């Protein structure tokens, strides 16, 4: 029982979930990855003198 | 009366050159046509030519004598060369060195000269092509603007130097120093009519760009057809624009607004730069004279220390 | 609109009353785990005071 | 003194008023010559 | 004829209204007179 | 006698004298706005003398209505000024941060910014639906939002990313112009940001596209011509002529960028950049030229 | 300066750049 | 005890993802 | 007729509306009578 | 009939909620009731 | 306008009568209630001396 | 326009005379508001000295 | 006629609203009557 | 323009002269009201001196 | 064209002149007015000195 | 009828939603009631 | 409108009846619960003084 | 039925996220939790 | 005829009311009169 | 003809009052005649 | 559809290569390259 044939019956339209799931998600690991590697390999910004 | 055939395909002086026409293709895609066409050459446009490029070979010149005639500095200092008006002594005085304002005042004369017969081009084609001559007095109108700043100004004040110096970054410094000189543009009441036209100029272009690209399906694009009967594009965005503020126009008045907001930002402009220096020498005093100044005792100053 | 009881018939379809299940068995389950969540979140540190 | 200058009423307050009623004006007149009826084509043969 | 009665009227109201604001301000700021303090 | 939508009177196509109440009439059409898809109606689909409200309309007049009101309480109170040409309506302080409070000064800028914004959302949605009832394109709403953006990157997002929310422009008549002038000597040779100076270039030349656009329009509107009198004439001068098409799309397109590359510029100059004249200093060290000349032509 | 909350607000000036595109990527697309 | 909660709600939100999906993808 | 019942409706409404709010404005501004602290 | 029934509701319904946020925020900003931390 | 009174006919709709009736009411109940609050807040605090 | 009096015919409707009567008491209620209110204001504090 | 009734009871209306406030508004700003403090 | 006067009858309407009538009583009153207004402000302080 | 005079029977219409003599009343008026007032403020405070 | 029964649903529930997101907005931004460190 | 009372009939459609004792019956539980909230929040902290 | 089933899931569906992505936004930019360090 | 009675009637009254405020503003502006205090 | 009346009498009226506008401007900005002071 | 799928992961790959490039040769904590 659906409420959306065209979309969770037919192949074509049960292909655009997936697709939808995957591109947040490599969005947000990409993200993610590339802020950790930025913060872990840095320095400390301002030694007092 | 008039044969297009002839006003387009005519030889020798009084005709036309380039006239096997070219053609673009990717312009024929993304704007609706393609063709280079043919160029007219009367008698007015080749003295605009001469002229011109006399000008710039004076300035050119001058630019490679400032280099020591060194190409790869040449390249590399392009950007920031300038041919100066001479210096403050000497006021309004001719018998100046070469280096010291003399190519500065005959490439100066070349231009005035060039955009003179540019005019006077635009105005016997806009005769000879059977079509109105709204386009000269524009033109004109930009030209008293060009006309204060270069010539009209640096008179009544007794010095060459209150003009710009021809080049690339010297145009900014001249409107930068402009401002420091005579206090503060922003409290220049000229400035801030021409501001007004200005902005609007653009904010009416964008609309009526967008009003008409999106009716294009009903062929809206037209204005000489839709000038004799409407059609459904053009209903169409009356009815947009009555809809959303209360009131809209046809497809004849625009095109008067979108003039006269260009022609009132020239002239205006024209007007605050000359009465800029003669009469107010400061804008700021002037302004807290006329109470449209607001006060400030207690800035919160924070806000622009690094 | 066999399945469906008499006074909710005129509102639902048959093919809506096996949804309208489901959604309200989500909203349950859904109620009963943000309980759970919020119990541990006050465990770890208070946000009344 | 609480007024401002004669120069500063002049070129501040004169084109302000000339601004704004000159654009009444003529707002009026465009949406007057706009809505008046002249020759159109006809919507329900017009597609 | 060359010009209508309408615009007449309207041109001279406009100067008339134009010239007496401009000359109150004028003699108001000019403080030669003793008016309003 | 057959009057022309230009003015003139032409004795006697198709065409014929229709009054604006029979197009007015026939093209309403109502049920088609943005919201009836959303929630199956629209609450209000009705027209309020010339003006259509829909759900956005009434968002964007009490977003103006509460906006107005909080401007004039701020330079008529707590300012006692009574002229709109003093007014000084500030942000808060820059030590508070990106918090407010009632009771510290600030506060009613935070008010009226909050409503502008919601007005300026509704007009844009409002916008939006009214081209969606006539059939329309969406290009109005494009170069809107573009103005929009414009002004949601000046209040919103330059303050937030620099963290303490003093950074937002005061909204008062000839004092935002000290904001302005400020913020534009903070960074010296504001001219020397490169996106600046596009954005003038965009500026100018939709300006003199428009001047042109209307003598050209206007240079045949009462005459009897054949229509391609326009072509000739723009190809004998500069040697091209775009089209009845091209000249609308070039004006929304210069339009739009222009205030695209000046908000760019903005946000750029905010954060990333502290002096544009050592923005440059890249230039004259590249190993092209680095090591051609002698004294003050060294570099 | 906090560099994520900035990247974030230029990624969003970026996005606010993409109607224009879109615009022109449709106008080249038709008229073929 | 903030990564042990984050590890919680992540689980959560798989768990339930898939669940969906599988009443969905059927 | 010259004007429409609506149109003086809507107008004297508008007007009133605005008087009230600036009146009250400004009597609040102006600090004479020890109102609202 | 001069107006419609619901344009007199809903300007009415405007006009009262648009004065009742006014009025609570002016008498919150002006400090002079000691009610929500003074 | 079977049951709108005779003075009010020419303007007022069949349907429209209870809905006024409606809107009526609340706008007592809704000066009551406010009268009320002025007096509580005088009470407590007065704001003009 | 039969309730309208015979003076006022070519001006009114019949519907806008009830109207007209309603704005009229109205203005009239709110002009003796206003008088008293003004009066009371004046006991208060004088504003002219 | 040259000019409507309608016309002339607009242009009249205004012109007097607008004189009179600004008349207000400058005697106000005089401070030359003690009036609001 | 049964009601308007012979020598008016090329400029007013029937329905305009009672605008017109109502125009002049208020502008009259005005007059008066003014006259008076300026007759007690000059009693209380001179503004020429 | 039947109260004009024979002389300006080619400029005037019937209906503007009405109109006209009611401007030259008023134009003669304010000339009269004026002229008091301007011999009164000379006699209060001579401005050319 | 003036009014139909879902536009004044759809009216109410946004009306609501809006005014109860602003009243805890606002309390929270007083700071009178130590909520969430404040 | 079978199952709508006499005096509603020309408002409410026989579906719609009980979508409206449904918003009614949410309505006041919400009610209960915010006067409880209310009581609480006052027993914390009182907001008044 | 005055609103359909389909336009009641969605309208719900839609609330639910803004509401759950907005008050983790607001609870994680608090003082009580830094971003959960 | 060369031109129109507009034409010279409309070039004649602007020119003449702009020479008359140009005169007195360089005229009054000089301060060389004593008017109006100084 | 080569030129018509009109055009030849406007550039001359415009040519003699630029003159005559230029000229007295010239000669008053100079300051060696003891003009107004 | 493949071809945007396909542009989209090449020219994040290739941004992020760049970029990862560029930070960590900023860092200096490796002893690459002097
Ligand atoms: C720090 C700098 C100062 C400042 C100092 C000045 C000065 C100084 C001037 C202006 C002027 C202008 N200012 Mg300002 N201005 C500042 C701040 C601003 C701000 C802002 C947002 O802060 C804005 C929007 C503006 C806006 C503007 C414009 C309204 C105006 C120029 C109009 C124009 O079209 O010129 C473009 C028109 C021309 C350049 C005319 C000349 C060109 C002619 C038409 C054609 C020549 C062609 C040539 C020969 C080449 C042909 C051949 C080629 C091959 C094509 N200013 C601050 C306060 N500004 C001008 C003005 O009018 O002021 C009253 C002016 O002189
Ligand atoms: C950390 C402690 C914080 C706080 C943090 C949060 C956060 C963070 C959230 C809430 C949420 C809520 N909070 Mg709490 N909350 C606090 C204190 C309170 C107080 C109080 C007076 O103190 C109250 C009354 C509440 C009340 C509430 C509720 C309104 C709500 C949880 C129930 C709900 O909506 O269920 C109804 C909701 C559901 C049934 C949703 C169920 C969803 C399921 C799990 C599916 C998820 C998506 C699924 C994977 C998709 C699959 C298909 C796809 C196609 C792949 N909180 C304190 C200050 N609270 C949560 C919420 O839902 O807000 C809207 C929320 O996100
Ligand atoms: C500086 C030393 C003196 C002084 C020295 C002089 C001298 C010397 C003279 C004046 C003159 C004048 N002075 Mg002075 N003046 C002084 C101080 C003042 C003060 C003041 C407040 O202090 C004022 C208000 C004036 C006012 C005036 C004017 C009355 C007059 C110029 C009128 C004009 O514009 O003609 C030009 C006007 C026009 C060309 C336009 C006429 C239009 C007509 C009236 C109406 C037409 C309407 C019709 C519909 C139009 C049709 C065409 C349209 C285009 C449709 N003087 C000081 C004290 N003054 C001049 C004079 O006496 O003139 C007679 C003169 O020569
Ligand atoms: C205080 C002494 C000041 C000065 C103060 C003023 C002021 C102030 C004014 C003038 C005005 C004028 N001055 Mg003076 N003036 C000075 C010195 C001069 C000198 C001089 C050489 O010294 C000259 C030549 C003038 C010349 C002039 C005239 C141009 C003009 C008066 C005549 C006119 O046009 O009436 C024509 C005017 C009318 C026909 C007006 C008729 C108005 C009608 C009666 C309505 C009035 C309003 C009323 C409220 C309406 C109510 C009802 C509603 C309509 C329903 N002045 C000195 C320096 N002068 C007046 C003027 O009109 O300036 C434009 C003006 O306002
Ligand atoms: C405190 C003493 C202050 C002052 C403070 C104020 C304030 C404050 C106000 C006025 C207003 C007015 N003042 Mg006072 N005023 C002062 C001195 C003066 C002087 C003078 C020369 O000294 C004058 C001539 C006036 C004259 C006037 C009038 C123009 C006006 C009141 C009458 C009116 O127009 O009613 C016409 C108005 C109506 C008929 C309104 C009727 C409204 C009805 C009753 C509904 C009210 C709202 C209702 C409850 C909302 C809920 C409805 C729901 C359906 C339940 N004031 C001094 C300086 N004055 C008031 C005004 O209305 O100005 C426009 C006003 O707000
Ligand atoms: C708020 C806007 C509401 C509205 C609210 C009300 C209210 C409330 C009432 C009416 C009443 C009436 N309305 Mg209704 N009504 C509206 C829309 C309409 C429309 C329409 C749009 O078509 C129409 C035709 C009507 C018509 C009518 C009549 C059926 C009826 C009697 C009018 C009358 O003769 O009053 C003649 C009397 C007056 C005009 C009195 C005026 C009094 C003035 C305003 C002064 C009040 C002072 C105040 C009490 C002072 C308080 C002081 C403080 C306490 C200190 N209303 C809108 C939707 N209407 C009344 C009714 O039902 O009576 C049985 C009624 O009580
Ligand atoms: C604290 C003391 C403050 C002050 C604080 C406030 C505040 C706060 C408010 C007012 C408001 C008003 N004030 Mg007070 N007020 C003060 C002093 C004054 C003075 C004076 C001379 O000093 C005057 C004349 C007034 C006059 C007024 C009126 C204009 C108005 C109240 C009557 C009204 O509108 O009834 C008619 C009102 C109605 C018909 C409302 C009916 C509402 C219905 C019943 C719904 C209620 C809401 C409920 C949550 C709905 C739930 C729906 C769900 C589906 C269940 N105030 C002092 C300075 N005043 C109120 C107002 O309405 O402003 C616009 C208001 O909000
Ligand atoms: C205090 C002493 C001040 C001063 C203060 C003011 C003020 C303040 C004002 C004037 C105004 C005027 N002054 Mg004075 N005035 C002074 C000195 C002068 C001198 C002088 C040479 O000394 C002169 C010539 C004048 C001359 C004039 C006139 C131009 C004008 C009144 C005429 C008019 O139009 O009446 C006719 C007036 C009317 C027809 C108004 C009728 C209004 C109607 C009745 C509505 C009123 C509002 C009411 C609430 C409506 C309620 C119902 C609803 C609409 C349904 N004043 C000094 C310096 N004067 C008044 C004016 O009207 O300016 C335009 C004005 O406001
Ligand atoms: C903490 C003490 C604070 C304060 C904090 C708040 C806050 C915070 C809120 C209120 C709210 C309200 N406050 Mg209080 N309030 C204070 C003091 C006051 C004073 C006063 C004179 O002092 C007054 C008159 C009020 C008056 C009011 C009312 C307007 C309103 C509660 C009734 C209502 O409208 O219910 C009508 C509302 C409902 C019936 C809500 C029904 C919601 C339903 C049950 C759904 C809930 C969500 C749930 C997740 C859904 C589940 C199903 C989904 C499918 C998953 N408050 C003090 C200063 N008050 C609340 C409100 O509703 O404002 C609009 C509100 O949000
Ligand atoms: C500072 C330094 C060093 C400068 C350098 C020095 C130099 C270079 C000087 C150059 C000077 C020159 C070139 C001067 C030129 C003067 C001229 C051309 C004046 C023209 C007058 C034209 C006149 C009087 C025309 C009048 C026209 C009239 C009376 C028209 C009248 C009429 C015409 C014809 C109509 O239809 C109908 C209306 C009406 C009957 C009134
Ligand atoms: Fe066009």
């Given amino acids: 029982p659906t409420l959306f044939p065209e979309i969770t019956n037919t192949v074509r339209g049960r292909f655009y979930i997936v697709a939808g799931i995957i591109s947040v998600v490599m969005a947000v690991a990409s993200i993610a990855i590339f802020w950790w590697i930025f913060y872990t390999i840095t320095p400390a910004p301002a030694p007092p003198l | ?21 070219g053609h673009v293709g990717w312009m024929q895609r993304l704007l609706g046509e393609g063709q280079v066409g043919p160029i007219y050459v ?96 524009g033109f004109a109108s930009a030209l008293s603007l060009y006309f204060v700043i270069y010539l009209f100004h640096p008179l009544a004040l007794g010095n060459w130097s209150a003009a710009p110096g021809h080049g690339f970054r010297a145009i900014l410094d001249w409107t930068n120093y402009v401002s420091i000189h005579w206090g503060n543009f922003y409290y220049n009441p000229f400035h801030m009519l021409s501001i007004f036209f200005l902005l609007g100029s653009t904010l009416l272009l964008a609309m009526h760009g967008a009003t008409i690209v999106a009716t ?91 | 609109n066999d399945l469906v009881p008499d006074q909710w018939k005129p509102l639902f379809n048959n093919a809506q009353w096996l949804v309208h299940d489901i959604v309200v068995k989500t909203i349950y389950g859904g109620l009963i785990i943000a309980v759970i969540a919020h119990v541990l979140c006050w465990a770890w540190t208070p946000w009344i005071r | 003194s609480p007024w401002p200058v004669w120069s500063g009423y002049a070129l501040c307050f004169v084109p302000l008023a000339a601004v704004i009623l000159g654009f009444i004006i003529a707002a009026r007149f465009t949406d007057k010559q706009a809505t008046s009826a002249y020759l159109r084509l006809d919507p329900a043969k017009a597609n | 004829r060359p010009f209508e009665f309408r615009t007449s009227v309207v041109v001279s109201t406009l100067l008339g209204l134009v010239m007496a604001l401009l000359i109150h301000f004028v003699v108001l700021s000019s403080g030669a007179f003793n008016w309003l303090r | 006698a057959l009057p022309l939508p230009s003015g003139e009177t032409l004795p006697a196509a198709s065409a014929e004298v229709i009054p604006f109440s029979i197009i007015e009439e026939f093209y309403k059409r109502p049920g088609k706005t943005l919201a009836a898809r959303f929630f199956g109606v629209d609450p209000f689909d009705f027209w309020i003398g010339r003006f259509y409200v829909g759900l956005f309309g009434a968002i964007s007049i009490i977003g103006i209505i509460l906006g107005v009101a909080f401007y004039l309480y701020e330079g008529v109170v707590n300012e006692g000024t009574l002229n709109i040409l003093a007014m000084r309506i500030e942000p808060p302080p820059v030590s508070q941060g990106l918090n407010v409070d009632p009771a510290q000064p600030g506060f009613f800028w935070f008010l009226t910014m909050v409503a502008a914004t919601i007005a300026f959302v509704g007009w844009l949605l409002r916008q939006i639906d009214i081209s969606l009832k006539l059939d329309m394109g969406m290009e109005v709403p494009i170069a ?51 996106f600046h100076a596009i954005g003038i270039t965009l500026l100018f030349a939709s300006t003199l596209f428009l001047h042109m656009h209307g003598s050209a329009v206007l240079s045949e509107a009462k005459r009897n011509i054949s229509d391609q009198n326009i072509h000739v004439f723009w190809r004998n001068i500069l040697g091209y002529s775009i089209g009845e098409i091209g000249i609308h799309r070039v004006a929304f397109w210069t339009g ?34 680095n090591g051609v000349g002698q004294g003050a032509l060294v570099a | 300066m906090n560099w994520i909350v900035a990247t974030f607000m230029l990624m969003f000036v970026l996005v606010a750049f993409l109607p224009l595109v879109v615009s022109l990527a449709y106008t080249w697309v038709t008229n073929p | 005890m903030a990564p042990f909660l984050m590890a919680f709600f992540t689980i959560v939100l798989i768990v339930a993802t898939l669940y969906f999906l599988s009443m969905i993808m059927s």
């Avoid at chain 2, 006003?7 to 026409?21: F, M, Q, S």
């Avoid at chain 2, 070979?57 to 008006?85: H, K």
Wanted: glycine share 8%; aromatic share 22%.
């Fill in chain 2, 216 to 306: 294009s399906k009903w062929k809206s694009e037209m204005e000489f057809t839709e000038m004799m009967a409407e059609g459904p594009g053009t209903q169409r965005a009356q009815l947009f624009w009555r809809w959303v503020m209360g009131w809209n126009a046809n497809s004849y008045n625009i095109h008067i607004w979108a003039w006269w907001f260009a022609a009132f930002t020239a002239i205006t402009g024209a007007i605050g730069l000359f009465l800029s220096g003669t009469l107010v020498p400061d804008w700021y005093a002037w302004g807290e004279t006329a109470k449209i100044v607001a006060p400030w005792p207690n800035p919160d100053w924070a806000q622009y220390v690094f």
């Fill in chain 6, 256 to 289: 739009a960028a222009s205030v695209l590359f000046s908000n760019l510029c903005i946000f750029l100059s905010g954060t990333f950049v502290k002096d544009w004249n050592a923005f440059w200093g890249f230039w004259d060290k590249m190993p092209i030229w």
């Fill in chain 2, 42 to 137: 009367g008698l007015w446009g080749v003295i605009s030519f001469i002229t011109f490029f006399a000008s710039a070979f004076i300035i050119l010149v001058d630019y490679g004598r400032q280099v020591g005639w060194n190409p790869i500095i040449y390249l590399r200092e392009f950007w920031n060369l300038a041919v100066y008006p001479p210096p403050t002594e000497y006021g309004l005085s001719w018998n100046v060195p070469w280096d010291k304002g003399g190519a500065w005042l005959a490439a100066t004369f070349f231009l005035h000269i060039s955009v003179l017969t540019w005019w006077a081009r635009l105005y016997t084609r806009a005769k000879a092509t059977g079509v109105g001559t709204q386009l000269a007095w």
């Fill in chain 6, 144 to 194: 809107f939002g573009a103005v929009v953006s414009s002004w949601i990157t000046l209040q919103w997002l330059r303050p937030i990313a620099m963290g303490a929310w003093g950074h937002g422009f005061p909204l008062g008549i000839t004092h935002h112009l000290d904001w302005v002038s400020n913020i534009g000597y903070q960074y010296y040779n504001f001219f020397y940001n490169p």
């Fill in chain 2, 1 to 21: 009366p008039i044969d297009l055939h002839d006003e387009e395909y005519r030889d020798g002086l009084e005709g036309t050159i380039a006239k096997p026409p």
